[PDB]
Write a protein that holds these residues in place. Structure first.
Motif, PDB file in Angstrom:
ATOM      1  N   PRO A  15       0.855  -1.197   0.016  1.00 25.33           N
ATOM      2  CA  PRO A  15       0.112   0.030   0.106  1.00 25.33           C
ATOM      3  C   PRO A  15       0.871   1.185   0.107  1.00 25.33           C
ATOM      4  N   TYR A  16       0.477   2.119  -0.850  1.00 31.09           N
ATOM      5  CA  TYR A  16       1.386   3.309  -1.010  1.00 31.09           C
ATOM      6  C   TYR A  16       1.594   4.250   0.342  1.00 31.09           C
ATOM      7  N   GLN A  17       2.868   4.530   0.537  1.00 29.89           N
ATOM      8  CA  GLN A  17       3.299   5.042   1.575  1.00 29.89           C
ATOM      9  C   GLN A  17       3.584   6.736   1.240  1.00 29.89           C
ATOM     10  N   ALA A  72      -1.750  13.093 -12.354  1.00 26.01           N
ATOM     11  CA  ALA A  72      -0.957  12.084 -13.173  1.00 26.01           C
ATOM     12  C   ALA A  72      -1.121  10.743 -12.493  1.00 26.01           C
ATOM     13  N   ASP A  73      -1.465  10.727 -11.380  1.00 26.77           N
ATOM     14  CA  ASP A  73      -1.665   9.243 -10.799  1.00 26.77           C
ATOM     15  C   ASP A  73      -2.675   8.705 -11.516  1.00 26.77           C
ATOM     16  N   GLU A  74      -3.851   9.249 -12.011  1.00 29.37           N
ATOM     17  CA  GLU A  74      -4.619   8.642 -12.644  1.00 29.37           C
ATOM     18  C   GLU A  74      -4.220   8.316 -13.901  1.00 29.37           C
ATOM     19  N   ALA A 171       6.533   9.422 -20.880  1.00 31.31           N
ATOM     20  CA  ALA A 171       7.388  10.409 -20.270  1.00 31.31           C
ATOM     21  C   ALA A 171       6.834  11.050 -19.072  1.00 31.31           C
ATOM     22  N   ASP A 172       7.329  10.880 -17.692  1.00 32.46           N
ATOM     23  CA  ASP A 172       6.476  11.741 -16.838  1.00 32.46           C
ATOM     24  C   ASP A 172       7.268  12.849 -16.489  1.00 32.46           C
ATOM     25  N   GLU A 173       6.423  13.979 -17.218  1.00 29.99           N
ATOM     26  CA  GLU A 173       7.035  15.413 -17.006  1.00 29.99           C
ATOM     27  C   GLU A 173       6.242  16.310 -15.761  1.00 29.99           C
ATOM     28  N   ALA A 174       5.877  15.566 -14.641  1.00 28.85           N
ATOM     29  CA  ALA A 174       5.296  16.102 -13.576  1.00 28.85           C
ATOM     30  C   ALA A 174       6.343  17.413 -13.051  1.00 28.85           C
ATOM     31  N   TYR A 175       7.450  17.232 -13.349  1.00 30.74           N
ATOM     32  CA  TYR A 175       8.157  18.667 -12.839  1.00 30.74           C
ATOM     33  C   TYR A 175       8.977  19.382 -14.101  1.00 30.74           C
ATOM     34  N   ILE A 176       8.489  19.224 -15.336  1.00 30.19           N
ATOM     35  CA  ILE A 176       8.766  19.637 -16.423  1.00 30.19           C
ATOM     36  C   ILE A 176       8.683  21.370 -16.472  1.00 30.19           C
ATOM     37  N   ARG A 198       1.290  15.253 -17.293  1.00 32.22           N
ATOM     38  CA  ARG A 198       1.594  16.605 -16.732  1.00 32.22           C
ATOM     39  C   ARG A 198       0.854  16.698 -15.471  1.00 32.22           C
ATOM     40  N   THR A 199       0.950  17.763 -14.575  1.00 32.80           N
ATOM     41  CA  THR A 199      -0.134  17.884 -13.539  1.00 32.80           C
ATOM     42  C   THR A 199       0.145  19.271 -13.014  1.00 32.80           C
ATOM     43  N   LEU A 200      -0.932  19.767 -12.124  1.00 32.43           N
ATOM     44  CA  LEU A 200      -0.941  21.088 -11.556  1.00 32.43           C
ATOM     45  C   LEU A 200      -0.523  21.030 -10.035  1.00 32.43           C
ATOM     46  N   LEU A 322      18.787  11.542   1.322  1.00 28.34           N
ATOM     47  CA  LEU A 322      17.646  12.258   1.784  1.00 28.34           C
ATOM     48  C   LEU A 322      17.199  13.119   0.577  1.00 28.34           C
ATOM     49  N   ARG A 323      15.650  13.173   0.338  1.00 29.80           N
ATOM     50  CA  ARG A 323      15.283  14.176  -0.702  1.00 29.80           C
ATOM     51  C   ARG A 323      14.674  15.391   0.132  1.00 29.80           C
ATOM     52  N   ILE A 324      15.205  16.404  -0.090  1.00 31.21           N
ATOM     53  CA  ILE A 324      14.792  17.723   0.389  1.00 31.21           C
ATOM     54  C   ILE A 324      14.070  18.345  -0.651  1.00 31.21           C
TER      55      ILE A 324
ATOM     56  N   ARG B  42      -1.096  22.205  -1.009  1.00 34.07           N
ATOM     57  CA  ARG B  42      -0.659  21.042  -0.207  1.00 34.07           C
ATOM     58  C   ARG B  42      -1.648  19.836  -0.635  1.00 34.07           C
ATOM     59  N   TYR B  43      -1.228  18.389  -0.353  1.00 37.71           N
ATOM     60  CA  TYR B  43      -1.926  17.407  -0.830  1.00 37.71           C
ATOM     61  C   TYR B  43      -2.970  17.079   0.329  1.00 37.71           C
ATOM     62  N   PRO B  44      -4.232  16.666  -0.115  1.00 37.89           N
ATOM     63  CA  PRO B  44      -5.065  16.388   0.895  1.00 37.89           C
ATOM     64  C   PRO B  44      -4.953  15.186   1.682  1.00 37.89           C
TER      65      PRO B  44
HETATM   66  C1  LIG Z   1       7.333  11.841 -10.840  1.00 36.12           C
HETATM   67  C2  LIG Z   1       5.710  12.097 -10.419  1.00 36.12           C
HETATM   68  N1  LIG Z   1       5.046  11.724 -11.444  1.00 36.12           N
HETATM   69  C3  LIG Z   1       3.682  11.922 -11.053  1.00 36.12           C
HETATM   70  C4  LIG Z   1       3.110  12.343  -9.726  1.00 36.12           C
HETATM   71  C5  LIG Z   1       1.777  12.505  -9.497  1.00 36.12           C
HETATM   72  O1  LIG Z   1       0.974  13.650  -8.943  1.00 36.12           O
HETATM   73  P1  LIG Z   1      -0.469  14.094  -9.211  1.00 36.12           P
HETATM   74  O2  LIG Z   1      -0.611  14.941  -7.977  1.00 36.12           O
HETATM   75  O3  LIG Z   1      -0.701  14.923 -10.445  1.00 36.12           O
HETATM   76  O4  LIG Z   1      -1.074  12.654  -9.023  1.00 36.12           O
HETATM   77  C6  LIG Z   1       3.846  12.811  -8.901  1.00 36.12           C
HETATM   78  C7  LIG Z   1       3.798  13.284  -7.564  1.00 36.12           C
HETATM   79  N2  LIG Z   1       3.983  12.715  -6.498  1.00 36.12           N
HETATM   80  C8  LIG Z   1       3.975  13.151  -5.173  1.00 36.12           C
HETATM   81  C9  LIG Z   1       5.700  13.409  -4.671  1.00 36.12           C
HETATM   82  O5  LIG Z   1       6.621  12.376  -4.736  1.00 36.12           O
HETATM   83  P2  LIG Z   1       6.721  11.405  -3.884  1.00 36.12           P
HETATM   84  O6  LIG Z   1       7.197  11.978  -2.379  1.00 36.12           O
HETATM   85  O7  LIG Z   1       5.647  10.445  -3.740  1.00 36.12           O
HETATM   86  O8  LIG Z   1       8.084  10.375  -4.631  1.00 36.12           O
HETATM   87  C10 LIG Z   1       2.777  13.221  -4.499  1.00 36.12           C
HETATM   88  C11 LIG Z   1       2.018  12.121  -4.723  1.00 36.12           C
HETATM   89  C12 LIG Z   1       0.717  11.914  -5.302  1.00 36.12           C
HETATM   90  N3  LIG Z   1       0.574  10.564  -5.342  1.00 36.12           N
HETATM   91  C13 LIG Z   1       1.352   9.864  -4.554  1.00 36.12           C
HETATM   92  N4  LIG Z   1       2.340  10.681  -4.232  1.00 36.12           N
HETATM   93  C14 LIG Z   1       5.421  12.437  -9.265  1.00 36.12           C
HETATM   94  O9  LIG Z   1       6.519  12.972  -8.324  1.00 36.12           O
END
Ligand SMILES: Cc1ncc(COP(=O)(O)O)c(CN[C@H](COP(=O)(O)O)Cc2c[nH]cn2)c1O
Ligand SMILES: Cc1ncc(COP(=O)(O)O)c(CN[C@H](COP(=O)(O)O)Cc2c[nH]cn2)c1O
Lengths: 339, 339
Positions: A15-17, A72-74, A171-176, A198-200, A322-324, B42-44
């Protein structure tokens, strides 16, 4: 028992942490929005026209190449739902990377094929080439989470050639937004099997909205439309998202990115000076990976002070790291002083 | 092509399908809400504490027996995701009923076992009894959509005895606010395999929020938690939902139900007088099923006038029937006059 009726994979499943939150890559400060559409009694459109057009304009693509989802999770899940036949098909990712790729597949019941990146976090093209049989989707986070670096464009060309007519490359461009020039959005014309997430939630500072997008060719978007929930987006979200995606909104976003890049550069410089800090890796994002001496001891100490980071000590090849997340100058100082 | 890479079931799939809108069972008038939590960066929480507690209070259950999701539509999917092994397990529903039961299973790749209800829309207990082998989830909408009637409690006892230690029985109570006394929420103590779907989309007048709930025993809720997305609910939704679920909010909801029941009774009386109206079925909901002579001719005529109903002429045993959502007195008159 009730548990005996559940699927085996679900039974045995991963389960996701006053304090500072530099653990989830969220923008440090809240940008305020207010609802403008008071029509909550009615069902919303499946794909809100305003959101899709404003985002296509922004990303520089056609509206028919955009799909809005709950983050982007969906988007990660949908791709697996439309292309991977559980029990038959596989997914392929390259650790250490974002954890949701394996979680979604394991939850849905699809096989995970892993080809760890090279020592510099770049793609092991020969290994991937060796394990492509029976793979339908390949995920590649660029820039990568948690390491922070971009994947070599030349290698992305190679991956796309290797998968032509065999798999979808995502290509996961969540931070693009932190390195716009590095986006592969312009390659859609050349590669039909290319999909971009992509994501907001990050630069846009709207994680609490749960709004993300998938950029792909019309044929792929059309297939994704067949597996998505009928009304995936709520009206309050679609309303606030179209607001954030207005010209003035895009301008404000770029100003947040600028402020984060400047703060990130300060934080990296300041941490290099620190004794317990063995190595600080460069990043094209809003977070910094750093190897510490006795990282768990440092993680705990900071944790006990109210400074929350993200331990990566268990990830493949990230022991000691550690990620900051980059926050405000006041939060950067807190970490520096505390270190 | 890209299409050749998609799953077969997805390739060949049934995608969910000045004027008056009496076609989606939505409350006719908008109830206004405004955001109160400006923390969108912030994430909910995965399961917003305020939403879960306010709803448990309302439903009269323990917070550990509630699960919030993106509408009851997600609740339908989650149950299949946690209990049905695609290619091996089956789902069982009784048509004519709500279409999402079969759509979700067909999308996910699970078998659908159908046992049509009896002529009075009641359960065919002998048929169900004959097709329970290999079934993990049984869906039963009560009161049923599109017919409008409640399922006999005595028969529900029988279904629960038949499925004991074999399957999960899900009672879809999407319209239960219209006949509160008929809710099975109090049976959770006696049956571990019982699950109930709730929503804020109908009586609550909040369809645009995409907020629903699943009432079940802690063991079932715990299994569902393992298959749900990490942050299924957005902050704006969780904020408005906890507002709607406040005492005063529950009072306002009950007043909307009262106003709909009164308007429904008027509409039924008035339609019985109409010539083309052969039969008007009784309902414990916010919609009315009625058999018309040349229903498609009538459906079209109304459609051309700007009066949108829901054709049911294709549903098993509903030939000639049209479903009419109850709106305002002005909208009821429009249908009457137009008829
Ligand atoms: C590389 C990457 N790809 C997708 C997402 C998804 O974000 P959405 O909020 O648009 O669903 C993320 C964001 N993930 C994080 C933070 O990173 P981590 O600490 O989990 O590695 C928040 C999140 C959302 N669902 C699980 N975690 C991303 O980094
Ligand atoms: C019997 C029944 N069960 C669940 C739901 C789901 O509502 P959520 O909004 O909470 O997801 C509904 C509502 N369904 C409708 C209207 O009925 P119909 O005209 O489709 O038969 C709206 C809807 C939502 N997703 C698809 N359709 C319900 O009626």
């Amino acid at each position: 028992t009730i548990t005996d009726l559940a699927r085996e994979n679900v039974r045995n499943l991963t389960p996701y942490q006053g304090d500072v939150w530099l653990n989830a890559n969220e923008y440090p400060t809240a940008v305020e929005f207010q609802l403008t559409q008071q029509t909550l009694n009615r069902y919303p459109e499946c794909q809100p026209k305003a959101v899709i057009e404003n985002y296509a304009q922004y990303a520089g693509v056609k509206p028919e190449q955009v799909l809005v989802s709950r983050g982007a999770d969906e988007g990660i899940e949908l791709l697996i739902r439309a292309f991977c036949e559980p029990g038959k098909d596989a997914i392929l990712y390259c650790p250490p990377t974002y954890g949701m790729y394996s979680v979604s597949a394991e939850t849905i019941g699809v096989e995970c094929r892993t080809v760890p990146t090279l020592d510099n976090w770049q793609l092991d093209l020969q290994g991937i080439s060796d394990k492509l049989d029976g793979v339908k989707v390949v995920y590649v986070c660029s820039p990568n989470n948690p390491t922070g670096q971009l994947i070599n464009p030349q290698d992305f060309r190679t991956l796309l050639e290797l998968t032509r007519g065999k798999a979808i490359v995502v290509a996961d461009e969540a931070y693009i937004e932190f390195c716009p020039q590095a986006s592969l959005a312009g390659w859609l014309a050349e590669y039909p099997h290319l999909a971009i997430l992509r994501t907001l939630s990050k630069a846009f500072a709207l994680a609490g909205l749960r709004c993300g997008f998938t950029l792909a060719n019309e044929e792929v978007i059309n297939l994704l439309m067949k597996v998505i929930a009928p009304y995936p987006l709520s009206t309050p979200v679609a309303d606030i998202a179209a607001q954030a995606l207005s010209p003035q909104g895009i301008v404000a976003m770029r100003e947040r990115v600028a402020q984060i890049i400047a703060e990130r550069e300060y934080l990296i410089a300041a941490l290099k000076e620190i004794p317990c800090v063995e190595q600080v890796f460069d990043s094209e994002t809003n977070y910094i990976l750093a190897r510490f001496k006795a990282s768990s001891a440092v993680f705990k100490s900071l944790w006990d002070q109210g400074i929350i980071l993200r331990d990566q000590n268990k990830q493949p090849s990230l022991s000691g790291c550690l990620r900051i997340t980059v926050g405000t100058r006041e939060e950067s100082q807190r970490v520096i002083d505390a270190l």
